[PDB]
Amino acid sequence: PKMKTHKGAKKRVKITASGKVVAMKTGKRHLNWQKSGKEIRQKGRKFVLAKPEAERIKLLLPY
Template sequence: MPKMKTKSGAKKRFKITASGKVLTAQVGKRHRLINNSPKRTRNLRGTAALSKPEATRAKQWMPYGRS
């Protein structure tokens, strides 16, 4: 059986931690930032964990990531 391919979009967007959580960048930090308060823009830095159903789907796209 051939190797399974990782979705290239998923490997660019997600990171799987050692405990199995899936991290991604916060949403809402690309454009139209003038409408946000500076506090909100600051709080959107860093990463956020995906919800359980979304994390399950993301792990399907990365068969060789940590499970």
């Protein structure tokens, strides 16, 4: 019956216009105590490939 939208996905990925899948970099959630600004700074979304193909299949209906 009507396939279901994986809400665990719907909560960490925004699927783009060209079809690419986007999510936030992993790291800076609590890791830190002293990481270069460069590292803690360089965290603002990214690509994924062959793996997002899989992602998109879970976000069916919500296109």
